Amino acid sequence: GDKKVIQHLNKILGNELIAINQYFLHSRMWNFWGLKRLGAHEYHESIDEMKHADKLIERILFLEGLPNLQDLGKLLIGENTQEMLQCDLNLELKATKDLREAIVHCEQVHDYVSRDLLKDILESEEEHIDYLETQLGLIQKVGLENYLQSHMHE
Amino acid sequence: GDKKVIQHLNKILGNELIAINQYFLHSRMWNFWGLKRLGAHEYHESIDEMKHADKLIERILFLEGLPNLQDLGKLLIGENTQEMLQCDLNLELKATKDLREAIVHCEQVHDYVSRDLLKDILESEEEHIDYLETQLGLIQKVGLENYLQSHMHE
Amino acid sequence: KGDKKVIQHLNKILGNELIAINQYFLHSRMWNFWGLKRLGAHEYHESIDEMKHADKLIERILFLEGLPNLQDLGKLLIGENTQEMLQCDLNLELKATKDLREAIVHCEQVHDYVSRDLLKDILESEEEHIDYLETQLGLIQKVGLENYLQSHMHE
Amino acid sequence: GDKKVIQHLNKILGNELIAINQYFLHSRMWNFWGLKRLGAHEYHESIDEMKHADKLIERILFLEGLPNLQDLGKLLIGENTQEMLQCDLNLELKATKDLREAIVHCEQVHDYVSRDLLKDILESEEEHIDYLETQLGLIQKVGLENYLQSHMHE
Amino acid sequence: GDKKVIQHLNKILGNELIAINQYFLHSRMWNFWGLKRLGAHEYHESIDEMKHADKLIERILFLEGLPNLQDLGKLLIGENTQEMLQCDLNLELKATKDLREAIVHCEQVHDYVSRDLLKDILESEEEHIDYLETQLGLIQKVGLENYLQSHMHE
Amino acid sequence: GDKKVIQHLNKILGNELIAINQYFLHSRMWNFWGLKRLGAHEYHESIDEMKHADKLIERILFLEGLPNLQDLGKLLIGENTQEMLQCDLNLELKATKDLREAIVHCEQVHDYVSRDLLKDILESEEEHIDYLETQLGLIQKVGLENYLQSHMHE
Amino acid sequence: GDKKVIQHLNKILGNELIAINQYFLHSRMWNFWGLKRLGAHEYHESIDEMKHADKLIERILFLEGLPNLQDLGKLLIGENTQEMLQCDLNLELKATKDLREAIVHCEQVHDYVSRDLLKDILESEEEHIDYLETQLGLIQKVGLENYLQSHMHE
Ligand code: HEM
Ligand code: HEM
Ligand code: HEM
Ligand SMILES: [K+]
Ligand SMILES: [K+]
Structure with a gap:
C-alpha cells in the first residue's frame, strides 16, 4: 500500500468516526424530544457512516x-x-x-x-448535504414550529 | 406474608386505582374533544394501570x-x-x-x-413520565395549536 | 346541553358500575386464588362487562x-x-x-x-347477571356445595 | 467466583436434587394409583426442578x-x-x-x-407453594373424595 | 411381585441414578470447556438414563x-x-x-x-459401551488434540 | 436525575465506546487473516456493545x-x-x-x-468473559494451529 | 477507436487468457489431488477471467x-x-x-x-490478490497439513 493513500484513508476514517457519534447523539436527542421523524432519519445517517467506516x-x-x-x-x-x-x-x-x-x-x-x-462515500455525503440544505430551507419556507410539527411522527 | 409489605402493596394498589380512573376520564375527555390520538394513548395508559392493579x-x-x-x-x-x-x-x-x-x-x-x-411497575411508570415530559416539551417546541392539531387523528 | 337530572341519574348508574367493577374483580381474584378457576373466569368477565358499561x-x-x-x-x-x-x-x-x-x-x-x-341495554345485561346468580345459588342447593365447588375448579 | 456464593449455589443445587426425586416419585405414585392429573402436574414440577439444577x-x-x-x-x-x-x-x-x-x-x-x-428460581418455588396451598385448601372446600375424583383424568 | 426381582430392579435403578448425575455433570463440564459436541452427546446419554429410571x-x-x-x-x-x-x-x-x-x-x-x-435397558447400555470404546479408540487413531478439535462444534 | 448516577452511566458508556471500536477492529483483522469464524463472532460482540451504548x-x-x-x-x-x-x-x-x-x-x-x-449489560459482559475464557482454554486443549484451523470457516 | 487504447485492451485480454488456463489447470490439479475446496475456488477464479475476457x-x-x-x-x-x-x-x-x-x-x-x-476488472483482480495472500498467510498460521485438510471437502 502507498503510504499517503493510507494516511488519507485514515483521515476519512477519522471523519466518519466523528460523524457516527455526532449523528447518533443527535438522533437520540431528537427521539428524546419526541421528534421521531428526525431521530429516525438521523439514526440512518449514523448507520451509513458506520458502513463507510467498515469499508x-x-x-x-x-x-x-x-x-x-x-x-x-x-x-x-x-x-x-x-x-x-x-x-x-x-x-x-x-x-x-x-x-x-x-x-x-x-x-x-x-x-x-x-x-x-x-467516490462512493463522496456521493453519499453529497446526498446528506442535499438533505441538510433542504431541511434548513424548509424551516424558512414553512416556519420552525410547522417544521418541527412535521417531524414528530415517523 | 410480611405485614408492612402488604401495607406497601395496598398503597401502590391505591395509587393504581386513582390512575386507572384519572387516565380513563382524561382519555374520554380527549375523545370527546376530537383529540383522538391523545385519547387512544391515554386509554392504553389506563389499561396498563389496570394490569398492574391485577398483579x-x-x-x-x-x-x-x-x-x-x-x-x-x-x-x-x-x-x-x-x-x-x-x-x-x-x-x-x-x-x-x-x-x-x-x-x-x-x-x-x-x-x-x-x-x-x-420494579416492573416502576419501569413502566418511568416510561409514562418520559412520555408526559416529552409532550409538555413538544407543546413548547411546536406551539399548543400545532400540538393539538397533531393529536386530532389517530 | 343535557338535562341536569338525566346527568345526575347517569352519574348514579355510573357510580353503581364502578362499585360492581371492583367488587367483581376482587371476587374473581379470590376465586382464582382458591383454585376455583371457572368461577374466577366468569366473574372476571362480569367485571369487564361492567367496565364497558361504565365507558358508555x-x-x-x-x-x-x-x-x-x-x-x-x-x-x-x-x-x-x-x-x-x-x-x-x-x-x-x-x-x-x-x-x-x-x-x-x-x-x-x-x-x-x-x-x-x-x-335499557345495561338493564338487560344486569338482569342476565341476576339470572346467572340465582341459577348458581339454586345449583348449590340441587347438587350440594362440595359438588358445586368441584364443578368450578377447572375452566 | 466468590467461595461463599459457590457454597450457597451448591446448597440450592442440593435442594433441587432432593425435589427432582421427591416429585418424580410422587408423580409416578399418583400415576400408579390412577390420579393422572396429579401425576402429570407433579411430573412438570419435577422437570422444572431439573431445569433449575441445570442452570x-x-x-x-x-x-x-x-x-x-x-x-x-x-x-x-x-x-x-x-x-x-x-x-x-x-x-x-x-x-x-x-x-x-x-x-x-x-x-x-x-x-x-x-x-x-x-431470584428466578425463587419466583418459581413461590408459584409451587401457591399451587400446593391451593390444593390443600381445595381438599377442605370440595372434600377429599371429590378432590381426588377431579384428578383422575388428565 | 417377587421380592428379589424387586430388589434387582431397585439395584438397576440405583445404577441409573448414578449414571444420570455423572453424565449430566460430564455434559456440562464439556460444554463449559467448549467441547459442545461431547457436551450434547453426553446430555443425551443422561436423558436416556432418566427414561430408563422412569420405566x-x-x-x-x-x-x-x-x-x-x-x-x-x-x-x-x-x-x-x-x-x-x-x-x-x-x-x-x-x-x-x-x-x-x-x-x-x-x-x-x-x-x-x-x-x-x-433386556431393552441392556441393549441401550451396550450401545453406550460401543460409543465409549470407539471414542477412546479415536483418541488413539487421530490424536487427542484432533479428537478434541472435532468435538468443539455441534 | 442523580448526578453521580449520570457520572456512572457516562463511565459505562465510555467503556462501551472503547469495546465497540476494539472489537470491530479485531473482527476486521480476523476477517483480513481469513479467520472468518472469529471475525463473525467478534463482529456480533461489537454490535452488542453498540446496542448497550444506545440504551x-x-x-x-x-x-x-x-x-x-x-x-x-x-x-x-x-x-x-x-x-x-x-x-x-x-x-x-x-x-x-x-x-x-x-x-x-x-x-x-x-x-x-x-x-x-x-444488570442486563452485566449479564451480557459475563457471557462474553465466559466465551473468551473458553477460547483461551480451547487453544491449550487442541493446540493453537487446530484452534485457528477451526475458525477459518463460518 | 484510439489505437493505443486498443493495444492496451489487447494486452489485458492477453493477461486474462493466461489466467484462464493457469487457473483452470490449477483447479483440476487440486481436484485430482482431492483438495476439492481449492479446486472449486480456483474453478470460479477461472470463470471470472473468462467473463472479463468476454467484456x-x-x-x-x-x-x-x-x-x-x-x-x-x-x-x-x-x-x-x-x-x-x-x-x-x-x-x-x-x-x-x-x-x-x-x-x-x-x-x-x-x-x-x-x-x-x-477499473472493474482491476477491483476484481485485487480481490483475488486479497484471497491469495490470505491463503498464504493461513498456511503459516495453521500449518500446511491443516490448511490442506481444511480444503479437502467442498
Ligand atoms: C373506572 C373503572 C374502569 C373502567 C372504566 C375500565 C375500563 C376498561 C375497558 C373499557 C377495558 C377493555 C375491555 C374490553 O373491551 O375487552 C378494560 C379492560 C381491563 N380492565 Fe378495566 N376498567 C376499570 C377499572 C378496572 C379495575 C379497578 C381493574 C382491576 C384490575 C381493571 C382491570 C382490567 C383488566 C385486567 C382488563 C383487561 C386488559 C387487557 O389485558 O387487555 N379495570 N377496562
Ligand atoms: C430421578 C432422577 C431423574 C429422573 C427419573 C428424570 C427423568 C426425566 C425425564 C423422564 C425427562 C424427560 C425425557 C424426555 O422424554 O425427553 C427428563 C428431562 C430432563 N432432565 Fe431429568 N430426570 C432425573 C434427574 C435429572 C437431573 C439430576 C438433572 C440435572 C439437571 C436432570 C435434567 C433434565 C433436563 C435438563 C431435562 C430436559 C427438560 C426439558 O427442557 O424439557 N434430570 N428427566
Ligand atoms: C457510538 C458508537 C456506535 C453506536 C451507538 C452504534 C450503534 C449501532 C446500532 C444501534 C446498530 C444497529 C444494531 C442492530 O440492532 O442490529 C449499529 C449497527 C452497525 N454498526 Fe454501529 N454503532 C456505533 C459505532 C460503530 C462503529 C465505530 C462502527 C464501525 C467501525 C460501526 C459499525 C456498524 C455496522 C457495520 C452496523 C451494521 C449496519 C448494517 O449493515 O445494518 N458502528 N450500530
Ligand atoms: K362428585
Ligand atoms: K486438524
Whole structure:
C-alpha cells in the first residue's frame, strides 16, 4: 500500500468516526424530544457512516496499514434542531473537502480501487448535504414550529 | 406474608386505582374533544394501570392480605390538554416515590418476588413520565395549536 | 346541553358500575386464588362487562356536557366464601336494577330517548347477571356445595 | 467466583436434587394409583426442578466451583395424596428460606447475575407453594373424595 | 411381585441414578470447556438414563415394591476428556454386569415382562459401551488434540 | 436525575465506546487473516456493545444528563489471536468491575431502573468473559494451529 | 477507436487468457489431488477471467480493433499447493500493473468507458490478490497439513 493513500484513508476514517457519534447523539436527542421523524432519519445517517467506516477499515488492512480507531476528533453537538442541522452540515462540508483531497492523491498514485471507494462515500455525503440544505430551507419556507410539527411522527 | 409489605402493596394498589380512573376520564375527555390520538394513548395508559392493579391484587392475596379496592384517593382532573398532562405527571411522580419506598422495604425483609413485581411497575411508570415530559416539551417546541392539531387523528 | 337530572341519574348508574367493577374483580381474584378457576373466569368477565358499561355512561355524560363522577366509590359487598360472594353480587345487582328503572322513567319523561336506550341495554345485561346468580345459588342447593365447588375448579 | 456464593449455589443445587426425586416419585405414585392429573402436574414440577439444577450447575462451573451432585439429602415421601402435598410444601418452605439467604449474600458481594438466577428460581418455588396451598385448601372446600375424583383424568 | 426381582430392579435403578448425575455433570463440564459436541452427546446419554429410571420406577410400583430414589452411589467424575470417557465406561461395565444378574433371576421366577424391560435397558447400555470404546479408540487413531478439535462444534 | 448516577452511566458508556471500536477492529483483522469464524463472532460482540451504548445514551438523556460520546479511552489491540482474545478479556474485566460499582450506587440512591439496565449489560459482559475464557482454554486443549484451523470457516 | 487504447485492451485480454488456463489447470490439479475446496475456488477464479475476457473482446470489437485470442503467454504452473498459490499471485501482480498503465492511457485520451471497464476488472483482480495472500498467510498460521485438510471437502 502507498503510504499517503493510507494516511488519507485514515483521515476519512477519522471523519466518519466523528460523524457516527455526532449523528447518533443527535438522533437520540431528537427521539428524546419526541421528534421521531428526525431521530429516525438521523439514526440512518449514523448507520451509513458506520458502513463507510467498515469499508475504509477493510481497505486499509488490505493495503497493510493500521486503521486508526483511537483518535476521535471534535463532535459538533447542537442544542436545538436548527443548530444540530447546521452542525451536521458543517461537518459534511469538511468531510467532502477531505474526500476530494484523498481522491486527487489516489488518482496521482494510480490507486483506482481506493479512488472508487472514496467516490462512493463522496456521493453519499453529497446526498446528506442535499438533505441538510433542504431541511434548513424548509424551516424558512414553512416556519420552525410547522417544521418541527412535521417531524414528530415517523 | 410480611405485614408492612402488604401495607406497601395496598398503597401502590391505591395509587393504581386513582390512575386507572384519572387516565380513563382524561382519555374520554380527549375523545370527546376530537383529540383522538391523545385519547387512544391515554386509554392504553389506563389499561396498563389496570394490569398492574391485577398483579398487585394477586400478590396481596397470595401473601394472605386483604386487597383494598375500597379507598379511592383524589383524582387530578385537568380542564385542558396542558393541565391534564401535568396532572398525570404529578400523579406519576408521587407513584414512583411510593414505589421506591415499597422496594426498599421489600429488600429489607427479603421479599424479592414482591420487589421484582414492583420494579416492573416502576419501569413502566418511568416510561409514562418520559412520555408526559416529552409532550409538555413538544407543546413548547411546536406551539399548543400545532400540538393539538397533531393529536386530532389517530 | 343535557338535562341536569338525566346527568345526575347517569352519574348514579355510573357510580353503581364502578362499585360492581371492583367488587367483581376482587371476587374473581379470590376465586382464582382458591383454585376455583371457572368461577374466577366468569366473574372476571362480569367485571369487564361492567367496565364497558361504565365507558358508555362516561361517553354519554360528556356528550350531554355533564361531569362524569369517577371519584365517589360506594360500598363494596365482599363475601367470605363462595355462597356469600354470590349473594353479595346478587344484592348489588338488585340495587343496580332498581336505580336503572328509576333512571329510565326519568329519561322517558324528559324525552331523552337515546339515554333511555343505553340504560335499557345495561338493564338487560344486569338482569342476565341476576339470572346467572340465582341459577348458581339454586345449583348449590340441587347438587350440594362440595359438588358445586368441584364443578368450578377447572375452566 | 466468590467461595461463599459457590457454597450457597451448591446448597440450592442440593435442594433441587432432593425435589427432582421427591416429585418424580410422587408423580409416578399418583400415576400408579390412577390420579393422572396429579401425576402429570407433579411430573412438570419435577422437570422444572431439573431445569433449575441445570442452570445452577452451569453457573457454578462458570464461577470455577465444583458442582456437588453426590450429596442427596432426605426425600419426604408421603403415603397418600394429602401427605404427599404437605411433604412437597414442607420441602419448598425450606427451599425458599435457603434461596433468600443466598440472595442476601450474592447481593452483598456484588454477584448480581447469580442473584438474578436465584431470584428466578425463587419466583418459581413461590408459584409451587401457591399451587400446593391451593390444593390443600381445595381438599377442605370440595372434600377429599371429590378432590381426588377431579384428578383422575388428565 | 417377587421380592428379589424387586430388589434387582431397585439395584438397576440405583445404577441409573448414578449414571444420570455423572453424565449430566460430564455434559456440562464439556460444554463449559467448549467441547459442545461431547457436551450434547453426553446430555443425551443422561436423558436416556432418566427414561430408563422412569420405566424401572413404574415397574417397581406395579409389582408393589418401593422404588428407592434415596440411595445415590459413588459418581465417577473425571478431570479431562479421556478420564471422563473411561469413568463412563467403568460405570457401564458395572451396570451391564448387574443387568445380566437381574435378567437371570427374572427368568428363574418367570417374570418375563421384567426381563424384557431389563433386556431393552441392556441393549441401550451396550450401545453406550460401543460409543465409549470407539471414542477412546479415536483418541488413539487421530490424536487427542484432533479428537478434541472435532468435538468443539455441534 | 442523580448526578453521580449520570457520572456512572457516562463511565459505562465510555467503556462501551472503547469495546465497540476494539472489537470491530479485531473482527476486521480476523476477517483480513481469513479467520472468518472469529471475525463473525467478534463482529456480533461489537454490535452488542453498540446496542448497550444506545440504551445508556437514552437513559442518560431521560435523566437529563449529557451523554459523553467525545472521550474515547485506550483501545487494547492485540497482534495475534491469542493476544486479541486476552485484550478483550482484560477490557471485559475492567468493564464488569465498573458495572458493579455503578449498580451499588444505583441501589444506594434507589434508581432501580438504572440498576436494571446495568444488570442486563452485566449479564451480557459475563457471557462474553465466559466465551473468551473458553477460547483461551480451547487453544491449550487442541493446540493453537487446530484452534485457528477451526475458525477459518463460518 | 484510439489505437493505443486498443493495444492496451489487447494486452489485458492477453493477461486474462493466461489466467484462464493457469487457473483452470490449477483447479483440476487440486481436484485430482482431492483438495476439492481449492479446486472449486480456483474453478470460479477461472470463470471470472473468462467473463472479463468476454467484456474486453466486446469492447475491442466496438472500437473496431482486432481481438487477439491467438497469442498465449507463459502459464505459471506450480507443482504443489504453496507454489500454485504463489504462481497465481505472481500472475495477478503483473496483471494489476498492466491494468494501471492501461487506465492511465484511457484517461489521457478521454476513453472513460474503457477506463470504467478496466477499473472493474482491476477491483476484481485485487480481490483475488486479497484471497491469495490470505491463503498464504493461513498456511503459516495453521500449518500446511491443516490448511490442506481444511480444503479437502467442498
Ligand atoms: C373506572 C373503572 C374502569 C373502567 C372504566 C375500565 C375500563 C376498561 C375497558 C373499557 C377495558 C377493555 C375491555 C374490553 O373491551 O375487552 C378494560 C379492560 C381491563 N380492565 Fe378495566 N376498567 C376499570 C377499572 C378496572 C379495575 C379497578 C381493574 C382491576 C384490575 C381493571 C382491570 C382490567 C383488566 C385486567 C382488563 C383487561 C386488559 C387487557 O389485558 O387487555 N379495570 N377496562
Ligand atoms: C430421578 C432422577 C431423574 C429422573 C427419573 C428424570 C427423568 C426425566 C425425564 C423422564 C425427562 C424427560 C425425557 C424426555 O422424554 O425427553 C427428563 C428431562 C430432563 N432432565 Fe431429568 N430426570 C432425573 C434427574 C435429572 C437431573 C439430576 C438433572 C440435572 C439437571 C436432570 C435434567 C433434565 C433436563 C435438563 C431435562 C430436559 C427438560 C426439558 O427442557 O424439557 N434430570 N428427566
Ligand atoms: C457510538 C458508537 C456506535 C453506536 C451507538 C452504534 C450503534 C449501532 C446500532 C444501534 C446498530 C444497529 C444494531 C442492530 O440492532 O442490529 C449499529 C449497527 C452497525 N454498526 Fe454501529 N454503532 C456505533 C459505532 C460503530 C462503529 C465505530 C462502527 C464501525 C467501525 C460501526 C459499525 C456498524 C455496522 C457495520 C452496523 C451494521 C449496519 C448494517 O449493515 O445494518 N458502528 N450500530
Ligand atoms: K362428585
Ligand atoms: K486438524
